[PDB]
Ligand binder design. Sequence first.
Ligand code: HEM
Ligand code: HEM
Ligand SMILES: CNCc1cc(C#N)cc(OCc2ccc3c(C)cc(N)nc3c2)c1
Ligand SMILES: CNCc1cc(C#N)cc(OCc2ccc3c(C)cc(N)nc3c2)c1
Ligand SMILES: CNCc1cc(C#N)cc(OCc2ccc3c(C)cc(N)nc3c2)c1
Ligand SMILES: CNCc1cc(C#N)cc(OCc2ccc3c(C)cc(N)nc3c2)c1
Ligand SMILES: [Cl-]
Ligand SMILES: [Cl-]
Ligand SMILES: [Gd]
Ligand SMILES: [Gd]
Ligand SMILES: [Zn+2]
Ligand SMILES: [Zn+2]
Ligand SMILES: [Zn+2]
Lengths: 401, 402
Amino acid sequence: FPRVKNWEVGSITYDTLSAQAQQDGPCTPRRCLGSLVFPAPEQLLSQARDFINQYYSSIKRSGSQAHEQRLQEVEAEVAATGTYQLRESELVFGAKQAWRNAPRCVGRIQWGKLQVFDARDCRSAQEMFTYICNHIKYATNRGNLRSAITVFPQRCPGRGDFRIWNSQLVRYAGYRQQDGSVRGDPANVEITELCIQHGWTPGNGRFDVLPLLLQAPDEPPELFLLPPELVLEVPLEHPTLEWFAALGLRWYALPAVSNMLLEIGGLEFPAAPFSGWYMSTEIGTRNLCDPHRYNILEDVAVCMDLDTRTTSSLWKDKAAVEINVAVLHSYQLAKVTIVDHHAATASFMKHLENEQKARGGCPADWAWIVPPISGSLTPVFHQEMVNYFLSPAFRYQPDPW
Amino acid sequence: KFPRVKNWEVGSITYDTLSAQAQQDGPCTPRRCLGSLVFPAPEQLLSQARDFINQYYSSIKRSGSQAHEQRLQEVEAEVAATGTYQLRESELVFGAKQAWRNAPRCVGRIQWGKLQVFDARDCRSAQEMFTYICNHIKYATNRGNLRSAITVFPQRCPGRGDFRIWNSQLVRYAGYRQQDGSVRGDPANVEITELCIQHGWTPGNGRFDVLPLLLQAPDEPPELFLLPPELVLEVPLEHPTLEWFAALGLRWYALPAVSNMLLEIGGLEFPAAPFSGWYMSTEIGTRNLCDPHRYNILEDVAVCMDLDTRTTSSLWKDKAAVEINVAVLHSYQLAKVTIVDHHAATASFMKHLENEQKARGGCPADWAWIVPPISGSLTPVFHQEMVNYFLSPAFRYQPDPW
Ligand code: HEM
Ligand code: HEM
Ligand SMILES: CNCc1cc(C#N)cc(OCc2ccc3c(C)cc(N)nc3c2)c1
Ligand SMILES: CNCc1cc(C#N)cc(OCc2ccc3c(C)cc(N)nc3c2)c1
Ligand SMILES: CNCc1cc(C#N)cc(OCc2ccc3c(C)cc(N)nc3c2)c1
Ligand SMILES: CNCc1cc(C#N)cc(OCc2ccc3c(C)cc(N)nc3c2)c1
Ligand SMILES: [Cl-]
Ligand SMILES: [Cl-]
Ligand SMILES: [Gd]
Ligand SMILES: [Gd]
Ligand SMILES: [Zn+2]
Ligand SMILES: [Zn+2]
Ligand SMILES: [Zn+2]
């Protein structure tokens, strides 16, 4: 059992939960790859079983009357049609567990408070879109953001899946140019490439909210326009640097990742958008300052009058920090939920403490838990971590096109 | 089987073939990753030796005829009459550079070619030891124009005790225990400060009192030695615009010189082989000055900046840390003492990875330690995928001789 130590505290735990890691990671004793971004009836049955026992154990029905009944209900259902159906409650449990087991998420102390939308009765593209709109609106809540997931029908033998061709529900457009540059978010060119050619008249703004590409089974994907009152945005200003507002920057309220596949007791859900609220550094450092994102660092450095000719002026660091201050301030001023990296990591340490008492440990990925700036300043930096894979889980899947 | 690794800024993909020669084992399995953990005989002595010789002869291209199979059979034979063998001085230099070349956690390996290897294998006592060390410091400091160096004292061998340096670094500041629970000076060094005194040292009462050296000869107790004050180049810390900074009274030494690691070459072990480079500002700026249990001047600096330290979302911690790093960088350049910032350090490491990929088909790198402790994603190494593993020759950790 792994001996993990908090070097700022000198305290020790043993990760006993790691011993149950359902799958295998990419590391071996020969070489570690923990920095890599992307590492059948009896099969479905054994996964189904392991999950249903995990549910009844969680609710303390270990060996109960109602316990042995559901087991053979699944045994029957799977025996009859290979695949099987999740009870509503089993599905809510699945959604929370998957969030909870996500090793790269720093906001897991909120895992028990998640709202699950059951859209498993969905039938078409138009019906998907409505369900999404109710999601975006429930979850935005006029700025007071709330965590939620919307699950669509599980996968079925010999048939096209429901998919969301958008990586997030709200993504800005990315337009190529005559001089090969890019207008907008360049991470989203591949999907603007599509939406435009899927029947969408394109803008030219740096911050054009993309339409939703939604796909029903077999009868191919179908475009959808978002109502602009559904999509809450924050204009970005800085608390003492009056010129920052004039850069014309903004970001959206709602981090809503869609293109991941949810897996619960052997059932795979190709479409299941989940959303929380933003950590400041994701907007400040990754979205605005990354070289192949919006890449504003230098522009801001120039306006602060910093020496951009020499790395030793640390202009990059100085600019980056004030870009993060602008983000927080802008969100607070607009009363839209936001968390800074110090508050985030501090709550995560509390989470490790919780998980230690509750489950014997916690799957955490150090390289993603540590924030993109001021790493050593946060308390997760000097905390040793163990990464592994549990079920239920969120997985990646091939780009649906 | 080849580990496919990608640079996510550029989009470039390489295959780390070198990882296949992974000598040791790490703490990771497919069950779980432990990559964030800080700390994880004639027959096989000969197998280690053989592999080492085959590296060294392949180095100078001429490999597989001359004194190669000669040296092998010579080494294979030298183990027979004795057990332990001895390196050709050119083999020592080669292995010395290799051990730097191989260290997965050092962002400064662009320079591994230019290292000055001092052969102190004929060293005989604690006093000659001290003399080699003063010379090391003298050459490496070079009035502020720093040069990479390493001095190799005699290998561990049966029937003799070890040469050992008890200090973790050649230059370190003392750390006294006050009555009020606080520590005057560097808290990291309370232990070694305890020992120095118990072994006769008459201590100081300053926050930057340079420590003596405790030097150990085989089967002999460690002897105490004061570095001559004019041998230790120190830098006063001041901020290029914040004039009140200078009244914090801070300084750091010029030369990072780690003295407590084991050097392993071709099965042979050099428990005493101190090596030094030059600082990267973040080590001094963030780690030594801002860490809670190091010198811990962050809140203190923040208040003087009239930042709002009552709330995390003001980012007072980040703001104060950046100016502390600016002070370090500016002070070192003022003093004409060699230093390097994390943007420069990392950009060169990216070039190193390009060299190493062409040279050896890979490069052992520990992501969590290469990525600077502030502004991670502002540097190119953040978005570069890496493969961590153990190759020999190597610098290794070893027990405190007490
Ligand atoms: C409510 C507050 C939340 C916060 C503050 C938060 C924060 C974060 C952050 C900072 C990351 C790192 C992302 C990166 O570096 O790319 C992350 C990843 C992740 N989070 Fe959370 N998140 C929240 C809600 C949620 C919810 C509601 C779910 C699922 C139901 C979730 C599951 C995940 C997953 C699966 C990842 C890994 C995704 C990937 O790396 O592709 N989180 N989160
Ligand atoms: C010349 C300029 C050099 C720079 C800028 C540099 C920089 C660094 C840094 C920043 C670290 C990480 C330390 C930490 O985060 O605590 C490191 C680790 C390391 N470096 Fe250096 N270094 C230099 C020279 C050298 C030389 C000459 C050697 C050996 C001959 C060396 C060997 C090592 C080793 C073995 C480690 C890992 C030690 C450990 O993990 O405990 N470096 N280096
Ligand atoms: C650029 N990094 C690689 C990357 C690629 C993709 C893809 N394709 C998705 C990624 O998900 C990060 C993520 C996911 C969900 C989040 C939620 C719910 C809340 C929150 N605050 N932050 C979140 C961050 C990250
Ligand atoms: C947005 N998709 C394209 C893209 C663009 C840019 C740019 N410019 C950078 C990207 O890096 C993804 C990435 C790669 C490695 C990471 C590691 C080791 C750790 C970590 N915490 N996050 C990481 C994120 C991806
Ligand atoms: C807190 N870190 C744990 C730690 C433990 C041990 C042990 N045992 C050794 C460590 O050496 C880091 C190091 C080593 C050599 C360096 C050289 C030559 C130059 C330079 N600029 N920085 C360096 C940093 C760090
Ligand atoms: C007790 N020794 C002194 C000491 C003091 C403090 C304090 N305050 C912190 C210490 O941990 C260093 C450490 C721990 C984990 C690290 C990880 C995962 C990655 C990385 N790049 N560097 C790391 C450095 C050590
Ligand atoms: Cl995002
Ligand atoms: Cl140091
Ligand atoms: Gd101006
Ligand atoms: Gd001033
Ligand atoms: Zn690993
Ligand atoms: Zn990034
Ligand atoms: Zn530290």
